[model samples]
Target: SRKKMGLLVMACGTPYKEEDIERYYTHIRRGRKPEPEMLQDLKDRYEAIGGISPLAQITEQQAHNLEQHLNEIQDEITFKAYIGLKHIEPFIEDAVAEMHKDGITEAVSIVLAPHFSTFSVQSYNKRAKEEAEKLGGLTITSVESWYDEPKFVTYWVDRVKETYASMPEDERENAMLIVSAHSLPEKIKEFGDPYPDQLHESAKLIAEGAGVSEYAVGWQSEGNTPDPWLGPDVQDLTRDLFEQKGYQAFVYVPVGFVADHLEVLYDNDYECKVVTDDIGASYYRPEMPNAKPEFIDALATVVLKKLGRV
Candidate 1:
């Protein structure tokens, strides 16, 4: 009986840690960056996270943080968060029912992705709309993407700047910028998905805004399957930065996905770092903008501008 719309930040499932096994079962390797050398027994991950929905947790946390920022401190705007919508069937039914219960005559659903693409948020939004139609008479409006939100760009830039400022100047200029993003299948290109393009835009904006002036974007966590996807994979790219280009310091900005889940922790932290060190480069991965006070403050500011309360 309140509020104007629904906002959710999405993420893929976070694979659990598999310390006992040396090799890992990663999504990007299967879908896009598959290698005969990467296959092995990555069993421990399933034991910990239960193949739990990574995106599910991200959406829930975003809603909670958003409410805490907009409602808890302000003492006025009161709203309820509906974090249901994972897997396939639940996504359809739960989203519809929540919309009905909330009586959301008008709503906005945006992915946590800074970029818009058919393979990611578009997939969720599409299925959600299909199921919502089952409801007798529910009018729905949603946001496709906020790829180039000026405020979002600035917020990201601020984080990047702060990270670089923390390190010494001698190590600053020579650092190789590795902007990593969630990977997708090349097959999706048939639909003309702009995930990659949107990512480049966000990276470019943040890079320019932060005055980095040099950086690169790479795909991570490709699903298993013999299929072509985006190029210059993270591992290979890291190698190029460390060996080919002879760059030593590394700064990684994951603009495609959010949170410190398995991909960021396992893939980038463990896997890519090994690749960097192999080529003699020291690497630094930027922490995602989580429930931190500054990030939460930025979210409130965006919600305000979106609602015209600013």
Candidate 2:
């Protein structure tokens, strides 16, 4: 019975449609008054990108593939995926109940999103913590942050430089690159949290590693929080590059996200891409190192380091 037990990777699920994105975002922006206008705006944008996604299906594949990959490193290793989203609480609840029944008493909980904060990685980790705590006897180990993984740095540097090289050499010098991370509230840093600072440091590290000196850092996905959030929003920064700085081409590198989640899908592709087109700047977004074998290898490295097995 103990032979069947394994680890659980916790990741935030993406919304399929306007209804889903708004369902959670409404709660986020409901501090003052609920607004349908905001929801409708998001719906239209998601619609442009083919509406909802088969996210659960994609995560299932990711789980299977990652587990198979992890097997080479550790024997008797099994992995299950728990996608944390507001809309799927009952499903997650059902799965957790089954895990309890299946003799899975010790589980290492992992946040699929690589970056750390009160929001992205912590959001999923907090949910995993709640689920793990409810089981009463499970050995739950949550891996929080891994911004400076060495091989992880190699993957980004390799991917970005390759993407950069794909451009014509004639126009390569004119490409003005901006690296953006998902924006968090400004209040969190006042408590001595290092999210914003860590984000900046990671972007700088990745840019330097890629040998990209033309790049800058900015924030994306600022919601309708009544209070101000982290500054230099991506759209405003795009305007500056095109108008003030007279940059003719733009490459948006999502430094903070590991996968092509909502921020990359909506914020960069649908939102920032339009601004670049309108302002006469050739805008392009590089793909995230999503579940690449090297990334998974690097992930395995972080996991081993966390477990003190390395």
Most accurate candidate by TM-score? 2
> What would the TM-scores of all predictions be?
0.79, 0.85
Model 2 lDDT tens row, 221-293: 8876577888799999988877776777788878777776667878898788889889877767877767667
| Model 1 per-residue lDDT tens digits across residues 1-310 | 3455554433443322333123223232342432445433234333333443542356567768876677755543454455534432234457667777777655445455666777767776775666567665555444566657676677678878888888777778778677868787888778988878887888888888999877888888775557877877888887866666677688888877656666676678777888877877777887777666666666666555655566
Error of 1 at 71 (Å): 4.0
Question: Lowest summed lDDT over 10 consecutive residues: which window, candidate 2?
Answer: 82-91
What ranges in model 1 sit over 4 Å off? 1-58, 72-78, 88-92, 102-104, 297-310
